[PDB]
Each structure stands twice: as structure tokens, then as C-alpha cells.
Symmetry: C3
Subunit: 333 residues, 3 copies
């Protein structure tokens, strides 16, 4: 009987950060309460000033990472304010039935709804908008995020021993398909109803114009670079709701990787690069051993360095010359 269970309210944070949680469950099963507010907003996605009409959960691309434990109940209040123009809903890949919740959460502007589901399977999972007839347009306008369902006793390695992370980050990777005119410049749009047929044509090329982490080219760089220290254990959750990606930490590895994100399976070890299929979230665990700047990329390097799918880690600490050293620095012959 669910009314006898503790309720706990979570206050979400903006990606790439993740709200407070406990790896090993300190309580029995709970109803974990979340609220998200849908926001249709203009977003500038590149250095050139290209502006799209984004569709977001909670104002960000990606949507925030939700964290629960196996056999908790997730209760989501989903709000669509009357300042929006479109119908929206939510499909959780973590959930069982009704199109992942999609059939039960259709909200017009000015409406809200509350969905509850039991988190029966441990893993990282995609969530996304999926309104009938408009699914890829909403997803590829930014309306997707992820949920992590931890095992009650936390993460384990391939031998069943504990793995504990010191820091966690959520990297949402987004493919955008900005319509172009015949000369190749991006088109602008007044009403999404007028945008719609050009959006479809752009999608049908299967060729994204931009592929970004955290909603924009360069979003996870400079002052917004991810951070760690030598010796810290970092979990990076990565999602792609529509298109395959292949993350790689330049100068590191995925020590333990769940490429398709499901924690009942043993992790793959020592990965250089891993494939996260479109419609999937994955997770990689790494212990940093060297200080300095690392690039975290989709290792289609064109997608990374030309289309935007690259971020940075800045790592503090002590350089290890046993692991790597310049024996003779670059010099003339």
C-alpha cells in the first residue's frame, strides 16, 4: 500500500550537475516526488548565433537527471504553462506501460498532470516527449533527459565488489536539424506550425546540422568545464535520445562502462570508446590518474570538432611521469 510509504521531495538541478542522492539506499522504498515545468524558449546553439525554438523540460537541454533507487516509486508532476503553445507529454524508458507514461501525460498549455510509476529495473534510462504525430520534432528540439535507477546496494564491478563514485555528471548529447535554404544558410521561423514542414524535411536528411553537449557548442568548456582531482572516481552518465553516439575521454578511458546503461549486467572494462545507441543512456566510471585538460567527445571526430559534440574536463593534481613523460621535447634536427 503506497500511502504507507515515505514521500521525499527532490529539488532538481541544472545539467551537467545532479541532485543530491545516496548511492546505497539509507531507507526502504519511497515515493520520490519530482516536479518539472515545460518551457518552450529560444536558444542560441553555436558561436555564429544560430537561434532555434527549443522545447525543454525545466528550461534546459538536456532535461535534468532524476535519481531514484530500484523499487522506489517515481511521482512526477508535469506542468505545461499557458505561456507555451504546444501539447507535450513524457515517455520514461524506465517505466512499464502506457507508452512509458506517454499515453497518460498529454498536457495542453495551461494543464498539469501527475504520473506515478514503479522503478523496477536498475540502470540509466532516457526520458523524452512523444506527442502523437510529432515525436521526432519534439525530441530533436531538445525535449529529452534521463533518469538513473540505482540498485539499492549501489554499483558493483564485474566481480560483484562495490564501486563508489566521488562525483557524477550528466552529459546530454543533442542532435539538431536546423532547416537550411538552397545556399546552405539556416532559415528562421515565426510559428512552429509554419516551421513544421521544413523541420520534417531537415530531419529526413538524417544529417544533423549541430550535435552538442548540454545544449550548445562549447557549453562544457571554459568556466563550465567539468572538474575533478587526481584520484577521484567520476561517473559520467551520457544520453542520446535519437541518434547513436560514441563517447571517448581523450587522455583517459572508461574503466567500467555500461554502454547500454543497465546495471544488472557486468560493466565492460578498460574501454577507449563505447557505443551508446540512439534512444539509450549509458554510464562510464573512471578514476583520474593525471592532471590537466581532457577532452570528452563523441568519437566521430567530425561530429565532435566540427558539429559541436566536445566538452572539457579540468583535472587538478600531481603529474605521474611513470605513466607518461616527454623524453625529448619537440625540437629541431
Amino acid at each position: 500500500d503506497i500511502s504507507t510509504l515515505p514521500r521525499v521531495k527532490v529539488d532538481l538541478v541544472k545539467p551537467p550537475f545532479v541532485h543530491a542522492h545516496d548511492q546505497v539506499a539509507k531507507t526502504g522504498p519511497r515515493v520520490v516526488e519530482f516536479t518539472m515545468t515545460i518551457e518552450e524558449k529560444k536558444l542560441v546553439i553555436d558561436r555564429e548565433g544560430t537561434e532555434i525554438h527549443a522545447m525543454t523540460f525545466n528550461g534546459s537541454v538536456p532535461g535534468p537527471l532524476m535519481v531514484v533507487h530500484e523499487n522506489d516509486y517515481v511521482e512526477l508532476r508535469l506542468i505545461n504553462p499557458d505561456t507555451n503553445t504546444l501539447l507535450h507529454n513524457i515517455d520514461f524508458h524506465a517505466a512499464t506501460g502506457a507508452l512509458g507514461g506517454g499515453a497518460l501525460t498529454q498536457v495542453n498549455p495551461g494543464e498539469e498532470t501527475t504520473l506515478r510509476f514503479k522503478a523496477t529495473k536498475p540502470g540509466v534510462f532516457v526520458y523524452h516527449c512523444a506527442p502523437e504525430g510529432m515525436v521526432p520534432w519534439h525530441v530533436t528540439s531538445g525535449m529529452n533527459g534521463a533518469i538513473m535507477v540505482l540498485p539499492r546496494d549501489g554499483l558493483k564491478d564485474e566481480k560483484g565488489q562495490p564501486l563508489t563514485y566521488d562525483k557524477i555528471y550528466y552529459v546530454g548529447e543533442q542532435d539538431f536539424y536546423v532547416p537550411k535554404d538552397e545556399a546552405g544558410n539556416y532559415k528562421k521561423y515565426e510559428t512552429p506550425g509554419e516551421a513544421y514542414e521544413d523541420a520534417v524535411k531537415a530531419m529526413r536528411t538524417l544529417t544533423p546540422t549541430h550535435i552538442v553537449f548540454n545544449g550548445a557548442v562549447g557549453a562544457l568548456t571554459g568556466d563550465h568545464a567539468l572538474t575533478a582531482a587526481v584520484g577521484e572516481r567520476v561517473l559520467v552518465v551520457h544520453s542520446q535520445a535519437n541518434r547513436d553516439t560514441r563517447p571517448h575521454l581523450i587522455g583517459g578511458h572508461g574503466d567500467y562502462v555500461w554502454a547500454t546503461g543497465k546495471f544488472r549486467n557486468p560493466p565492460d572494462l578498460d574501454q577507449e570508446t563505447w557505443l551508446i545507441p540512439g534512444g539509450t543512456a549509458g554510464a562510464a566510471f573512471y578514476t583520474f590518474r593525471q592532471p590537466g585538460v581532457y577532452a570528452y567527445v563523441n568519437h566521430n571526430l567530425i561530429e565532435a570538432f566540427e558539429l559541436g559534440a566536445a566538452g572539457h574536463f579540468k583535472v587538478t593534481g600531481e603529474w605521474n611521469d611513470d605513466l607518461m613523460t616527454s623524453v625529448v621535447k619537440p625540437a629541431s634536427m
Copy 2:
């Protein structure tokens, strides 16, 4: 000595259905006899009435699913009637030698051939046409299917315990590359010899115009939706002879998945989405827990909802509010 073995004749059925077989072998090894007749035919593949000249095994796209057990012999009589115009053959990925049988099965119109091979490796495998110089054109015109080689003691989970399916379906996913004129309309063709250079150009874009399940947009919907009941265990075999796909059951999971389809490996558990590489068959096992409509899609959602790679399950039975419920139905604020 093969002449001492029982022979059994199989009568094939049209996908997505699968011919009668036993999961656990009730006999010793057998010679299992199949017949297929090649048919070049016009097929309408979308709602707009786009018509292609398809190349088929047994009149369908995909070709039928053949089912044997490990260490059975497969004996295939392949017939190319003189009403066809092209040379064809067959490559079984399940087989060892002679280009999977391709080098031994070249049949002109008016010819037949009989190939035998031993099914030494358990799994689901692609078969396809592969005539020298014309391989991708035949494959991408529909001339591919799959074969399932069951272990003699049936399927097992990750702990070596039995997994028994109540129903099985075969979903063949087909990428088509229909030639387009400069304005973007599909071109029509008299003789495949006149079609050939435009077919090559269309393929070289690497951008399919249609991606369909069971030979057409909407083929696995309405009266032709897949069915199950709450509590039933369903195996879905999925093949893609040319191009990667990423199946997802919207509102469900892959409880046990062999993404690359080979049953000596343990299955991956609790998958949301899995990657089947082009040139591969995979298999996913799910026990339905909720009634209603489910969408089964390639989770590149553009490929699903715009290009055609989506089908439906209709599931009867009892709704489970513990797993999912609407707490507050969509309403104004």
C-alpha cells in the same frame, strides 16, 4: 552418414509469423528441408503509393524465418522461375564456406539448385542474396531474411536457467533507396538494367528514403499489429541485412537481449534499446506486464516516425496500477 538421418519437410509461413518448431529438440539431428521460390514483383511501400521493383525470397520482404537446431543440416531447394529476369543466389551467415553458399547457388531464371549446410553455431543469422557485382542492389531491393539455429536444449538465461517463449515474431527491417530526381520526387523504371545506375547513385548517398518493417510503412499496424496477452513471454527476432538499427519497445523493455544474436553468449538484461549492426540478426525476450498498445520502433525516431520503421503490439489483459498509474489526470490549473 547423412543418408541415415531423418528428413523433415518444413512448410514456411509469411513474416512476421514463424513456422512450427520445438524449442527443445525432441529428436536427434535431422536434415531439415526447405523450399523457397524467388519472386521479382512490384511492391507499394508507403501511403503515397510509391512503387518499387522488389526482389524477394518467397514473395515477401523480409524473406521467411527458417528455424532449425544446432547440428541439424539445412537443405534448401532454391527456385528461380523463368518469369524472373535476374540471376540470384543465397548467402547464409549461419553457414561455413563458399561465401555462405553464395558461390554454389547462382541460379538463372529457369534454374533451381539445392544446397546443404550444417548448422554448427546457435543463434539468429541473416541470409541474403549476393550475386557478384550486384550485392547491395539485391539486398536493398528486399532480398534478405533470417534463420534461427536454436540450441538443442533451447534458450537459457544469464545464469543458465531455461527461457521458454510462448510466442515468436520475426521483424525484418528494410532500408530502401528509391531514386529521386533533382526536385526530390521518386523516379520510376521499366527495366532494372535502365534502373541500375540510378539505383547505385541513390545507394551511394547512404541515406535511405524509406525504412520499413515487414515490407511497407504501417505493415505491422491495425489488423496486422502483433499481439500478446499480459503474462505471455514473447521472442522478437529482428534483422537488418545492410544497416544498423536500434529496436525499442515503447512502454516495455528487452528483458533478455542477444543484440548480435548468438545464443552461446549470455543475454544482456533489462535493455531499453539495443543496437543490431547491419548484417546481423538479434533477438529480444520480453514478458508483457501491462495491457494496451505498444509501439515497437527503431529508436532513431526520425527513421521510425518519418521513414517508416515502426510497428505496434496490441496486448490484452489486466492493468497493474502498482507499476504505473495516473495520480492526477491532465487538467487545468
Copy 3:
């Protein structure tokens, strides 16, 4: 203390061959010394005579395969002769820190450098050039290879028993993006500075014009076909530094496959086709059971047979009719 360790000089060989090494380590840890010389050179990549300005390690596409054991040190002397025009460097995915060595190995024409790193993780790994701002252009001009870090006790199967190969080959698969004019003919270029913006535009299509093994259409055919004998155990290392591929041995299998190439993980068994993600090296082990010609392809068959990603094995020995036979040869009805 590294100065107390044995040093061993390796003399590299051109792909697809691999330099001499021992599967099981016959010594303790060593400093293994390699030299590579960068060469910018014109390469003809197809039957039509299309010529590109390639960028190579040691004169070949791919670069040579380097082979060490776990916990050896790799010491690479990298030479950029003053006959080249561009700045280059090297990122080893096998290495830990400084962008895989990229930050410590920037060499102008007329310079050299010597990098040392400890090979802490066993597997096959990509190496590639990665100069700041120019990464995909260098990689997709051919400047990539692979390194194999064997476990000290050699390869093991899924049960921990030894796997010993009799022959090893290295297949580097390269996506090229040759710029085209509006009519579709390939453009030619004087200075790479003048080529640069057209190279970027060609890459941004995400549609390679050529995909080749060992640097050219048909490179691994005829007199340069790979060879084996019935009963021989062959390891094929395959890399793709930028783009996903899906190798398949037509008429065979991958008996043991490390699709993402990391030997601490058990191999996948009996694969028909496997996915190597872009930015990854993989390895497949097969024992040949039948003589004749086999095609080794990327099983996107358009990529194979139209764009160039196909090679041949020629296998000598004894035909096994139990495994496969023509019962009735192709004939009229």
C-alpha cells in the same frame, strides 16, 4: 626505475602485416622502442584515379600496428621531416594523460620528439594525429593506426583457457571525404591551406566518398589478398578512428570477438557481424574450416561494394562436404 629495464628496438612493417612479437611474454617488462616518420604524400585511392593529399605515419594508410605487452613502456620517436608542410602530433588511446600524448608531441616540419608511456591496459587501441583545431581533417586524411597491448600471458577465451593465433593481420578502415563540385566530380587542390575550407564542408556532410581497407579500393585483393590455410587460427585486428564499422567474414564467423577490443573482457562468441565504434579498434579470432575465397567486408554492403570497404582472404586446403555441399548444382527445370 626505468633505466634498469631492458630496451628492445622494434622494426615496423607495412600493414596488413604485423611486426614480430611473442604472444606470451618471454621477458619481464621492457621499454619497447619505436620510430615513425610522418609523410605527407599523394595517394591514388580508387580505380578511377582519384588522388588525395594523404597524411601518414610511416608512409602507409593505416599507420603500422605496434605490439607490446601489458606494463611494458612504449617509447616512440616521432619524426616530422622538413619536406612536410604541416604540424602533426600523436594521441594514443592506450595511454593515460596529456590528451593521449597529443599535448606533448606537437612537431613542426624539421622537428622530432620522443614520448614514453606505460601500457597499463590490455587491448587493441587506436592511435591518431590530433593537432588543435585540425583534428578530423588529419584523421580523415589517413593519419591513424593502432597499437596492440597483449596480456603478459596472451589471449584467453571466455572460460579463461588459452587462445593462440597462428597468423595476425591488421585491417585499417579509412573514411575519406573528397570534396566535390556541384555536378559531383572530385575537386583537386594545390596547398592544403586552399583545400582546408572545402575539406571541412565535405566532412560536414557526414557522407564519406570512399571507405577503404589499407588505403585504397581493392588494396586487399589479388596478389595482396590475405592468406590462410584450413585449420589455421587467424587474428584480425580492425580499426576505425572516426566512424562506425561492422566487419563480417563472408563464408565464416568471428569465433571469438572483442568488438570494442579490450582483452580483460570475455570475447563474444560465434559472431556473424560485430560493431566497432568509430574511435575504436577491435579484434576477431577465427579458425578456418573451408578452403577458397572469402570476402572480408564492412557489412553496410553499400559501404563495402560501392565505396570500397572489402578485401579478400584466399584459403588453401581441403573442402569439407559435411559442413557444406551442393546437393543439386544449378540447372534447368
